[PDB]
Structure formats: C-alpha cells, structure tokens
Ligand binder design. Structure first.
Ligand SMILES: CCCCCCCCCCCCCC(=O)OC[C@H](COP(=O)([O-])OCC[N+](C)(C)C)OC(=O)CCCCCCCCCCCCC
Ligand SMILES: CCCCCCCCCCCCCC(=O)OC[C@H](COP(=O)([O-])OCC[N+](C)(C)C)OC(=O)CCCCCCCCCCCCC
Ligand SMILES: CCCCCCCCCCCCCC(=O)OC[C@H](COP(=O)([O-])OCC[N+](C)(C)C)OC(=O)CCCCCCCCCCCCC
Ligand SMILES: [Ca+2]
Ligand SMILES: [Ca+2]
Ligand SMILES: [Ca+2]
Ligand SMILES: [Ca+2]
Ligand SMILES: [Ca+2]
Ligand SMILES: [Cl-]
Lengths: 376, 376, 376, 376, 376
C-alpha cells in the first residue's frame, strides 16, 4: 500500500502534478519494461524501413503505414478499459472490505467473558486466538506474502498462532479442502462451554459473541471466493487483446515516413513519436491499474499489507481481551460536569475552522405575515 | 471455474500477455467456430467478387463496398456491449453471492444443539442435512451439472442427501411448484421440537439458528429468481443484432478491392484483413463474455463448480456438527502468555514485508509552538 | 416473464443467434408497428421526391438531404440510451427484489405458533393470511394483471383472500389513502394476543415473527414507492426526443438521391436503406427495453408474473403453516451415519464435473529450505 | 411528483411518444424560458450579421462562423452530462429511500404497548407522536413546502404536531444546532418509563421498539446529510460551463451564412436551425433533469410530496396505535379451511394471466437410461 | 462544505447559471493558478514563434502546429476523467457515510442506564464520552483540521475530551499502532460493569448498547481504511498524465499561425484561443473535482466540517445523556385526541401543496361488468 493521502489533503496548485514525481507504486515502475520493448521494436522497424527496404519495398511499406494509421481507433479501447478497470477497482475495494478485523469481537470477548483468574484469561485468550487463527488461515490461503511468512502449518505453530494441540486436532480433522473454517466451529463450541460453565452470564451475550464471529466467517468466506472465482479469463484476454492490438498497429502506423514523398501528415520527420509514447503511457498504465489490482494480495507496491494486519490484529486483540479486561481508567467527573453548553477550545492554527451550525436549507426562507397564517 | 489468481498476483512484465497462452476458458475456445464461419464467408465473397462478377458487376460491387465501409460505426456497438456486459457481470457476481454456505449454520448447530448421545448426533445431523437438502434441491433446479448428477429425487435418495422417509414426505406435500422450500419448514419445526425437548437450552439460541436458516432460504430464493427472471430477451437480442449487423456489414465493406482501380484506401491488396479479424476477436469475445456469464450454472469452463460445492458442503457440515461437537483442542497457555507485545517471527522470504504501522495521514503535519496554543 | 435461461446455459456456437428466432418478448414484437410507420413514411418521402418535385425542387431536396445526413450523430443518442436504460434496468431488478415472499415468515409461523387443535390451526392460518392479504393489497394497487383479477375488495372476499369480517373491518378503518398497511397492524396485534394467550411461548419468538413481518412491510412499501415515484418525466421525454429526432432526421438524410447527379456517397441507388433499418432496430429496440421494463407490473411478455406469485404464495404458505406444522419426516440415521468422509456418487453424465478442491492461490508457491526458515 | 406509471404499463405503439404531450413536469415547462432567450440571441446575431456588417465585416464573420462550427464537440458534453446526471439521479432515489415511514414503528407500538384505558391510549399516541414530530422537524428543515407550511415551531404547536409542553421543553434544551434529534431521546426515555411501569411487558419488546425508532433516526440523519452536503459546487459549475459554452459557440457557429458565397455546407439558407434547436432541447433538458432532481424537496412538479407524506403518516400512525390497538377482525375459518390446494378464481379479464409454475431451467433436460446411472 | 441546496430547490430560469457567480468552492478558485501558468506559457510560445523564429523556422513550427492539432483527442480524456471522478465521488460519499454520529447510542445510553444520582450521571457521561473520544481519536488521525485543533493527546486532555486518568491509561497501553480502538474496549467493559452493578437492568439492553457502539467502531474503522488505502497511485498518475498531455499538446497545436500562409483553419488570427480556454476550464475543473474530493478531510472549501461535527456531537450527546435522562415533557392528550381523521391546517403559502392521495397506478383502470366476473 502506497499512501499519499496527506499529499492530496487540499486541492493545491499542481496537486496531482507532484504525484508524478513518485517512483514506488508508480506508472513508470509498472510499465518501463513494456515501454522499453515497444521502443526497441519501433526503432528496429524504423531502421529496417529506412535502410534495408528498396525503393519499391519502401513504397509498399509507406502504403501499409498509411493503411495502418487509418485503422487505429481509440473509442473501443477506451470503452473496454474503462469498464474492465471499473470492475477490477470495485472488486479490489470489496476485497479490502472483507479483510477481517477482530475489534468488535475482541470488545465483546473482553466485556462478556468473566474472570480475572488464570482460567478466565486462558478462555478469553483462546477465543480471540481462534478468531486470529481463522483469519491467518484464510490469509495464508489467499496472500502470497502471508504464505511466504507461513509456508506450512508448523510455521503457524512456531509463530504462536496455533498450539501443538490445535495442530494435532487440525490434522485429525483433515478433509480434502481448505480447513480455514475449523476455528469457527472451535470458537462456537468453546463459547457454548463457557456459557454452560458460568463464564458467560447470559445466553444473549453468547448470541452477540457468535454473531460477531459469524460476521468474521462471512468476511473470510468472501476472501476465499474472490481468491477462487477470478474475473472471467475471457474478459481479461479481450481487454489485453484490445490494448496490444492497438499498439502492435501503432508499431507500423506511427512510423515516420520519408519526407521527400511528402505524404499527407508526414511532412516533418521527427525521430521520436512523442504522442504515441504518451498514448502508450496512458493506455498501458490504465491496463496496469487492473494488472496490479486484479489480485490485491500479491506483492505489488499497492497491494494490501496483510502481514502488518495480521501482526496488528494479534497484538491488539490479545491486549484487549487480556490486559484490558475489567481494567478501566478511573471514572471521575469531566471538565464539563456542570457546563450545559460545552465549547472545547480551538488552537491558533485551527481557529479558522470554527463554524456556525447549518440549520437546514429552508432556514433563510422569507415569508410575509399573510403567507404564514393558517387557513381554515 | 478457471482460476488464474496466482498468475496475476504481481504486475509483472507482460502479466496479462501470458494469459493469452491459455486454452480452457479462453477467447479462442469460445469463438473459434464463429471466426471460422466468418472467415469462410469472407473468402467466399472475395472469390465470387474476383472471379464470377463481370466488369460492370465488379464496379457495382466496388461501389457497394465503399458504401458499406462508410457505414461501419464502432461507437454504438461499444456502448451497448459495455453496458450489457456490465449488467451480465454484475448479475454473475450476485448469483455467486447467493450460493448458500452452511458454515454459520453448522457452527451454530454444533454449538447449541446439545447431547453426545445417539439422539443428539441424530438431531444435529438431521438439521444440517435439511440445510444441505434445501441447497441441493435449489441447485439441481438451477444448475445443469447438478441436475445431471441428480436427475430425479430418487437419485437424491440414492446419493444420501434425502432419506426414503423424507422422499415420501415430499411426495405427500407435492404442489404444482418447486418444492425446494420444504426443508426450511422441516428445519424450523425440528428446531422448535429440539427446544421444547430440552436439546436447545434457550429460545435465543433457537432464534439464532432460525435466523441463519432464513438467511440460507433468502439466498436460495435469490438463486431461484435469477434462474427464473432472465435478462429481458429484447436487450439480449438488441446487443446480438448490433454485433452481428456490424460484422455482416464488414463481410462486404472490408473486402480487398482490385488495386488497379486505385480506390482511396484500397491501394494495396493484402489477402488477409488482419484488423477486421482483430475487431472480430475483440467484439465477439466481448459478447462471448456475456454469453458465458449470462447463465453461470451451465457447463462452461468459467461456470461455477456447483457439484464440488455440494460435496464440500455436505462433508464439512456433517463433520462440523457430528465429530466436532464439543470436541475441542486442549486449552493451554499460548506462546505469548506473558508477552505484552507479541511479535511473531518472519521468514527470510517474508522479512521484506515487515512494515511500520500507518498512524494516519495527519501524523507528520508540523506546527510551531504558537500554532499549537489553545486560544481563549 | 420470458425465460430462456436453459437455452444459454453454455456459450455454444451461435448461442445468442438462436435467440433471434424468438417471437414472444422479442424486439420484433415490440417495434414492428413503429418500423412499419417509419418504412411507410420513408417511402412516401421517396416517392414524393422522385415524382412530385420539379428539377429545382429536386435540387433543393438533394441539398437538404446532404445537410441532414451531415447532421446525424450517434454519440449522444448512445450515451443517453445507455445511461437511461441502465437506470431502468436497475429499477426493474430492484422492483423484483421487493416482491414479498412469505417463506421466512411462514417457517417462523409454523414453528413458533403452537397447537394442533382447531384454535392453533386457525391462529396460524389467520396470521399467514394477513401476510398474504397485505401482499395482494399492494400488488393489486401496483399491478394491472392483479387488479384485473381483483378489481374490487369484494373480489378479494370472493377469492378467499379476505373474509367478510375483515372486509367490514377495513371499511370501518377507511382513510383517504391506500389501506395496504392495515394487515400488518392486524398481524402485530394478533401475534401479541397469541403470545399473551400462551400460543407463542417466548417473547423472542414474537420478536422474530414481527421482524419477518416488518421486512415484508418494507418490501411492500418499496413496491408502493416505485409505483408512485416514476422516473422523472423530463428524463424520459429527453431520451424519447433524442431517439425520435434522430430517426426523423434519417427520414430525409437517408433518402436515395438520383444517381445521375453523382453526389458523393449516392453513386448507387439501392431502394432499401438496409443500414438505416438496422439502426432503427438497434436504437428503437434499445429504447423498447426501457419502455417494457419501466413498469414491470404491466402485461408485457417480460413483465412479472404477479398472479402466479400470488397463487403460489397462498398455497405454499397455507400448506406450510397448517399441514406441515409439527409434521416431520421420521428422523433416522442417514446413509453416512459412520462415514467420516462422505462421497455421494456421480452419474455417467456428471462424472466429468468431479473436481479437486481449490486450496487457494498460494498453494503451489515454491520456496527453498533457506527461504522458509524463521529469522530471529 | 408526476406519476405516469399507468400510462407506461405496457410497451405499446408509441408508448413514450404519448408522454411528449404532457405539460406538468415536462421538458417544455422546464426549458422554455432558456429556449426563448437562446432563440432571441440567435436571431439578433443573424440580423446583425445580415444587415449591420459590411462586406469585409461579413467575410470576417463568415470565417468566424466556420471556425466556431469546427470547434463544436458533443463527446465531452455527453460524457459529463451522463455521469453528473447519473450521480444526481442516484442521490435523488437515495433521498427518497431515507424518507421516514412510521409503519413498522406504529405496528410495534400498537402491539407491544398494552392497555385499553386512557393511560395506554395516551402512552401509545405520545410515542407515535414523538416519531411524527421528529420526522416533520427534519422535513421542515430540508423541505421548502413543509417549511412554508410550518415556518415556526409555534406553527407546529398550532397544527397539533407538538404540544405547548413539548414546545417549552424544546425551548429549554435549545442548542445552537438543529434540534430534530430531541424527539428520539424523548421516545427512548418514554419507552423505558413504559417498560418500568409495566406497560411494556418484556425488555425484548422495548429493544424492538427502540431499534425501529433508531432506524427512523438514521433515515432522518441521512436526510439532514443530503440537505447539508451538496454535490460539490465545482462539479456543478463544470457541467454548467460545458453545456453553456457548447450553446454559446452554437450561437455563432450555427448561423446561416449567405448562400451566394457558396461555403461548404451553407448552400441552402433555411431560416430556422432545426437541428440546433433539437440539440438544445436534448442537452438542456438533460441538464434540467439534474436541475430539478438536485434538490428533490423543492417545489418542482417532480419534487417529492412531503406535505402529503406528513399528513398521511400522522393520520395512519394515530389510527394504527389508538383505534386499531387490540381491535382485530373476528377470527373465523377461511374459505380454504379444508382445501389442500387452494385455487383462487380468475376473472374473464385476467384468465389469460393464469400460468404454469416455472420449475427451473434444468427441468426439461433429457438424459438416457445409461446417462442417469450412478457410477461406483 | 459549501451548501447551495436552497439555491437549487426549484429548476428556475438559469438555475445553474447563478451558481457560476460563486467564489468559495468554485472552479475559478481551484484552477486560476493553473490557468495563469497555461496562459503565460501559451503566449510565451506565441511571441517566440512570431518574433524569434526565422522564415524556415516559422515554417517548421507551422508544420509542427498542424501535426499537433491533428493529434489532439478528447475521447480518451473524457472516458478516463469520467470513470476516475465517478470513483472519487463514490468514495467521497462513502467517507461521509462513515462519519460516526452518537445519536442512536446516546438515546440508548439515556434510556437504559438508570439513576438520577451522581453515580448514574457519571456513568452515562463516561460512556458517551468514551464514544466521543473514539470518534475524535480517529478524526484527528484522518483530518488535518481536527489534527491542527488537537495536535497531541495533551490537547485532548486540555479540551475536555479525555481525562488525565484516561490519558495515563492510554499511555500504559501504548502499542506501535493507532490507539483509536481503545475507547471501545473501555466502553464494553464499563457497560458490563454497569449491568453487573444493576445500573443496566437487563442484558438485552446491554446487547443494544454494545451493538450501537460496535456500529460506531465499524464506521471509524472504515474512516481509517479510507485514510490508509488511497486510490491506487498509478490510476491517479494515469488520469493526470492524460489531462496534462492533452494541454501540453494544446500549447503548440492551438497556436494562431500567421494568416498570410492561409493554412486550412488558420485564416483568421484571433489573439485569444477562447475555445482552448473553455476546454481548459472544463477538463481541468473536472480533474479538480477529484483533486478536492480525493481527500475530503483536508481544508478545501468543500471538505467536511469535522471540527463542527466534533463540537456538535459532544454538546448534543452530553445533553442527551445527562440533562434529558428521564426528563420528559408532560404527557397530555393531543389536539386530535378524539379526531379519527386529523387534518393539520395549511398556511396561505402552502395551501397549493395540499394533494389527494395516490391510490396506485391501477386505480383508474376501467372494466366492464362481464370482464369483472369470476370464472369457474
Ligand atoms: C495480435 C493481438 C495481440 C497479441 C499480443 C502478441 C504479443 C505476444 C503475446 C504472447 C506473450 C508470450 C508470453 C511469454 O511466454 O513470455 C514470457 C516472458 C517471461 O515474458 C514476456 O515475454 C514479456 C512479453 C511482454 C510483451 C511485450 C511488451 C508489450 C509491448 C507492446 C507491444 C509492442 C511489442 C510487440
Ligand atoms: C441482420 C442482423 C444480423 C442477423 C444475424 C443473421 C445471422 C443468422 C441468425 C439466425 C441464426 C439461426 C440459428 C439456428 O437455428 O442455427 C442453429 C445452429 C445449430 O447453429 C448455427 O446455425 C450457428 C450460426 C451462428 C452464426 C454464424 C456465426 C456468426 C459469424 C459472424 C457473422 C458472419 C457470418 C454471416
Ligand atoms: C422533433 C422531435 C421528435 C418529436 C416526435 C414527433 C412524433 C409525434 C409525437 C406525438 C405523438 C402523438 C401521440 C398520440 O396521441 O397518438 C396516439 C396513437 C394511439 O398512437 C400513435 O399515434 C403512435 C405514434 C408513434 C409515432 C410513430 C412511430 C415512430 C417511428 C419513428 C419516426 C418516423 C415516423 C415519423
Ligand atoms: Ca497485485
Ligand atoms: Ca454459462
Ligand atoms: Ca411493462
Ligand atoms: Ca427540485
Ligand atoms: Ca480535500
Ligand atoms: Cl435479540
């Protein structure tokens, strides 16, 4: 993930211009190799046409170049790229929205599962660990970085996400499909045991716990679905064919013909086809947006930081359910204890942001005394 | 389903280029027959024009060819294809999202329905079997592969999805519509019996069970709706007419006229209309995306693997509710039992993915001492 | 509703081509009258130009024809049609999604409302009948077919949807607005009475019943809203003006001028403007998609089968709550009672659909022994 | 709101054509003034060019006219209008979806709050009145028609929406922001009092009441947000600039030059630029769609009928909670009491809508005896 | 936020025209600097071409100018701008929808947490303060204005949002990530303590409180996600490159060549390229829409008023939970106590908005006596 949110907080002069001076996650980094290949092919064709071809061969090549330049169209490519990239971006954000966060679940586990003794600690930690284990089980299934961190279940054991007993239990239950769903059954059964054992005081709290857990399960299932059901290969091939056919045609139709022939539009022979290179940057970068985002769990610069998410979730959830259980700051009257209309101060840098309340769009409507009188 | 997610994890050089070397689920496989027909017709027209037609007939055909090539437009076809294919893809993903998964339901059934005896096993298995039976009842209604697996209800009995008693009960209830809804009524009544019989301890657990079951019912109803309410036939015919009229026009307007006439744009007579073939690939593949996805429960390469889903759901749900009921791994203190800030290790291949936390876009804003002072 | 889902299960050769041989719900049926009018006007103009007009008049008409043919543009029409038809289709599917189904409600009513005696039967049947009565009350408000079936409330009484006592009660409550909401208040009060009377055992079951009922109410309210708040008339008039202005212009700009004048592009005088007719089919059918779908509760071929839905809902709901109440198939051990890994068989026609499980996109990643070692 | 749903029930001959004969909410009513201004300016320019300008001045004006007519483009205007109007229409429907309806809430209040005495009546009426008061408080904040009906809180008191005691309480709580949220706090506290006082029998019923109330609060907050957060002014100005620049250019580039000069495309001097007027109608009406819908709570013909909604909600909710409380029609066996397969009759006008059930797209698949045999 | 809702209530003559006379949040304010730079560069190029260049150099520059003007295309730029700006606007509204409001939570806290003594006041105030503290913690993480108001946690203490004890507790829990989640764990634990202490009477009320709190947590997490996961930098760079390449090309291709050469389209040498400036305004303002909205928590005119939201939320929530707890207006019979059909009056200015109820689109259908007869 490349974050530039702070750089575009305000619409300043050349706001998006400055973003052109970035390398990581940039268009240049993504398409420099393709551009080099295209440039080499273009100039190889130029040299062949200029030197190797004879007079009649050169005339044939010139006729071909005019014919090609006539057959270059940018409407269909723009249409297909726009629609396909819109789909890819929508799926990319949907895949982010299905990354599980244990925050709701950990708050419920910390509040509801009672006991400051070693049994209560163990129970809360085990429940939140089951949540985290399901999450990383799915993430290592779908993310190459997480997989490289945990290439086997024994790596999960060594990293503390799973205990040896849990690993043995998983081995016992082995089915010929992904076992990422098992920690949810474990969580449900352990929560039921906690309720029956008196650690959870009321069944409605148990229902809340299991509802949050099931929300996490639905998110992980959506992650699995996105990993499994790719965008149809035919659509991807169609957009790829459109782009690459356009630029294969450009390789010939954008050659600088010999000026002496004085063909229409070829009067001046510049060596560098600047507009064709700009079109390459535009269209191939538009395609590279999809190429990077189509699988957001790879290792691109703009792909999600799954390993950081795993680490943060583990730390935060364990802290929330273990150290923060029934550990509250002292409850004392606040600064506005007897202030009916609290007005927190503003700093010098923020005083300009003090605003009057918006009362509605009808507030300033003006009516006469006659207009405002109720009729019978 | 053709999965190429691992191949597009990163935006590598020619990432989408390599996908052009795939056959299953490919554009080539989908439109090779249509392309062969188009090619044969094009060259039949070419031979007729070149040999059969007389001088005046050839001049008439040339005038017709110019007139046709003038009347070929790619804006409306791109518009209609983009919108129609977007609709088809949206419905395709919506239909995936309505495939029922018993995972939430099976976790609840495993946790809440109590008893390790043969009655508890039977009750849990029967409930989850009712869920699975409703699912396959709808799937065999909407999926041709599942139907070919279970062409009759007796096949469901032979496959273990339904018992003979359940088959007799279904026959007793026969109405002149699809009976996929019956297992939900059965599930509700059996859950109520379990609660009244003491197997379910609290009515809120019963409400959770029935909420998950009703979610599954809503998904199955959406599957039925998508199977029943097709995209309006008029829209499909409109897009088909657009595409096929375009290429019928191309059959004449893209013929290579005799060079001796030296018509504008026909100076060089290549035999193969390469750009017209590229346009065929592009547009007809764009249409074939919709043709494949319009009914995602057929037998195309990219259609959903419904039979695998049925098998996996049966296995996983039965295991979850029967063997995993109150069968938990030993609960022991974890590796970070007294570690306030757990830091799971990284491998050599994944050390590069260790990241500092993103603290927010306002973290690095700089303010002077005067700026940060509160004003009265 | 015209269902062709089975015909497009697979992307076969000419899959959408075969759909051009359909009449019901087809483009031909929808626009043949408009096409006949357009054809008659076109040829009337042709005959007037060819016979009535004098030499100078013919020259003026030819200049007008060139001027018109120059002023024909297909970009704005495609834009507006695409956006407007997308909106219409979105609203069409939203209106389908708000058709109420009593399946969740009937399952809850069958399970929760207890008693096999005549009072329990009457209570369950009355509750589900209130649901069905609200549904048909709204449907006859919004659907012309349902209205033609039930043109008055006395027709509802004669058809069994409402009792004479309910009709009298509705008459007593008459307000100067649609009374489709009354059965929901009746349902709520009757459910409360059932709970207070001991027929519903716990208030959480009552909350479930009323939640499902309120979901149905929200759907019916959305149906009312779609019936009431039409797509803004100005937008519809704008799209209509675009289409009809385009083809009014075509009536003159697409006339076949006299060849002897040898105008550019008019060298050959074919009598039938085939491309203009194809454009008519395309654009007017695109508009007819919206014309058919703008009100999906009319009597078009592709409009919803509301009467069938009403009948099916009544039959299914009454059967579910009355005959299926606490009437379960015998609960016996299933075929996989002691089979840890059930494998339901495949038929000969379906053996090809047996698939190996997809384990995730990271499954086949390869790492060396050094790469997989945890670092300190 | 202009409702034409009944007029477009079926896709009849010239279905959208007849809608061109409507005045209220029409394109003509919306843009006749702008069209008159444009027409006057166009013909003023025509007269100036024809009479005032000298020969050299006329030649300069002709060169300018050709230059302008060359610089008129309809692609960007169509793009921006389509996207902007799509956004406006989406927000318009979202704003409708956030209009609060007390139907779910009034059903719950009627059912759950017990007591046929004057205290129960007062409690139910007060709760539903708090709901209605919150609704109109927000509506008069955002709707000009409702504001004109209730230009002050004393008008709310005189109209019966608020009591003098409630007005005094609101005055006591006055904060420098919109107070539309207060009735929700009142409702919550009154419901809690009713539960503690025994009028609400179980806390789960209280939770249902407050959930429905909070749904209404969320809708009212969304109404406030839409009133407050306008579509960014820059976007609106951009689309306005596009449209008006297009037609300012047309004012000169669409002038009829003197035929004697025989400029290309100006051979015939018709006085009325019919196509330019059609383009004006199309594009300016497309913009007027957004102009009307951008604030749907104004007083346009197609703006929402907020006053009717307020009146209907008050009447219906008071009737539902007061007169309909525990007032049910007599519960008697229905017409299909012992009819396992009820078949409500059809009228002569509706017999054509009797349909056979759709059994699924796989129903008619045919398989041989060999194909249907299970394999081991 | 620039609100112009009241100005566009009705579609009046020149409704959007008047919005062109606005400065704050306007296109002019956003792009005047870029326009000045573009104008200066354009006229520098003009002067160089007119004075510095020699005859042959001027001819070369003229050929270059024709070549450039030929290579200027507005289809791809419009496509990419439309799609990208649509994405930006969608994310902008989504980010507004995730701004937390404590209204549902404060109503629940006021109702459910009992006790008019100093302990009950303290408990309610502390809970709602935890909600507000979580909100501002996230807002100061994502909003530059809020950060400038609270550049440190000690500023939060000085402003009354946090107590010194809470600050010490936060310091104790410090992890190397954003700690905005801590107040939710605090809230959950304090609510559990209140329930165990008898201040919350039933666990279902506790479940309601925690559900509302968790909704707020989900909103704050979405705010964090939008702050962290920027729109992919490659997409932004692509759109920026498209726009700036277009106008860099215009800098040369839109120069006014010397009339004496009488080049096609350059007959008249006006000094000001008015259409190019209009295109600049259009396209660069379209881009500036995204530039302003890409981060809606900056300090642009149209960015959200986060500081006002924070202040209003604090004031309203404290008032709701402290002063409004069990403080209700006197409950007395309303004005329509015995009025079965209440009709609140209309004013003279609003009498025109009195409407008859819409009874449904099928109300006015006419049928004969034969048509309405049920058939057997
Ligand atoms: C006719 C319709 C278009 C068809 C496209 C034809 C191009 C060839 C497609 C087949 C790709 C072979 C992939 C492969 O097996 O290779 C693997 C290699 C590692 O990765 C690579 O080969 C990297 C190759 C990336 C392509 C070159 C960069 C594209 C530049 C634009 C086009 C101008 C150059 C022709
Ligand atoms: C004027 C507007 C366009 C109208 C379209 C005219 C084409 C004919 C449509 C009628 C299809 C008959 C379907 C049929 O009953 O047949 C069934 C047969 C098995 O399946 C087939 O016939 C496969 C036929 C597939 C069509 C040929 C491939 C399309 C290639 C592009 C067009 C170039 C060739 C003309
Ligand atoms: C200048 C901008 C365009 C304006 C459109 C002018 C056309 C006339 C619009 C007024 C329609 C009168 C509706 C009516 O009261 O009539 C009712 C009659 C039954 O239903 C009918 O009249 C059916 C009439 C359907 C129209 C003819 C079919 C359209 C074919 C394309 C256009 C070529 C023919 C001119
Ligand atoms: Ca990636
Ligand atoms: Ca398919
Ligand atoms: Ca219809
Ligand atoms: Ca309006
Ligand atoms: Ca901003
Ligand atoms: Cl609940």
């Amino acid at each position: 993930t490349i974050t530039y949110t702070s750089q575009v907080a305000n619409a300043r002069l050349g706001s998006f211009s400055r973003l052109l001076l970035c390398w990581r996650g940039s268009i240049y980094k993504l398409l420099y190799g393709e551009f080099l290949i295209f440039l080499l092919c273009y100039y190889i064709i130029r040299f062949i046409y200029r030197l190797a071809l004879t007079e009649e061969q050169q005339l044939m090549f010139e006729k071909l170049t005019l014919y090609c330049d006539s057959y270059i169209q940018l409407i269909p490519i723009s249409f297909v790229l726009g629609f396909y990239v819109t789909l890819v971006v929508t799926r990319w954000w949907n895949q982010y929205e299905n990354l599980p966060w244990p925050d709701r679940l950990m708050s419920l586990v910390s509040g509801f599962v009672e006991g400051k003794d070693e049994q209560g600690r163990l129970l809360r930690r085990t429940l939140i660990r089951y949540a985290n284990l399901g999450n990383v089980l799915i993430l290592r299934s779908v993310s190459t970085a997480v997989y490289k961190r945990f290439p086997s279940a024994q790596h999960l054991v060594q990293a503390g996400f799973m205990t040896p007993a849990e690993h043995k239990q998983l081995e016992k239950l082995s089915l010929p499909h992904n076992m990422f769903w098992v920690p949810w059954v474990w969580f449900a059964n352990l929560s039921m045991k906690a309720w029956l054992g008196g650690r959870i005081r009321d069944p409605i709290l148990l229902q809340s716990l299991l509802n949050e857990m099931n929300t996490l399960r639905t998110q992980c299932g959506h992650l699995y679905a996105y990993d499994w059901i790719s965008i149809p290969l035919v659509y991807t091939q169609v957009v790829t064919v459109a782009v690459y056919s356009f630029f294969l045609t450009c390789l010939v139709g954008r050659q600088f013909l010999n000026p002496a022939k004085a063909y229409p539009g070829h009067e001046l022979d510049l060596v560098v086809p600047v507009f064709t290179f700009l079109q390459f940057f535009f269209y191939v970068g538009w395609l590279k947006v999809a190429e990077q985002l189509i699988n957001p769990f790879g290792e691109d610069d703009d792909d999600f930081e799954t390993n950081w998410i795993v680490d943060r979730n583990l730390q935060v959830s364990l802290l929330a359910v273990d150290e923060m259980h029934q550990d509250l700051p002292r409850m004392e009257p606040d600064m506005y204890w007897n202030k009916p209309e609290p007005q927190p101060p503003y700093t010098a840098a923020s005083a300009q942001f003090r605003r009057a309340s918006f009362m509605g769009s009808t507030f300033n409507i003006s009516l006469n005394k006659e207009e405002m009188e109720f009729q019978p």
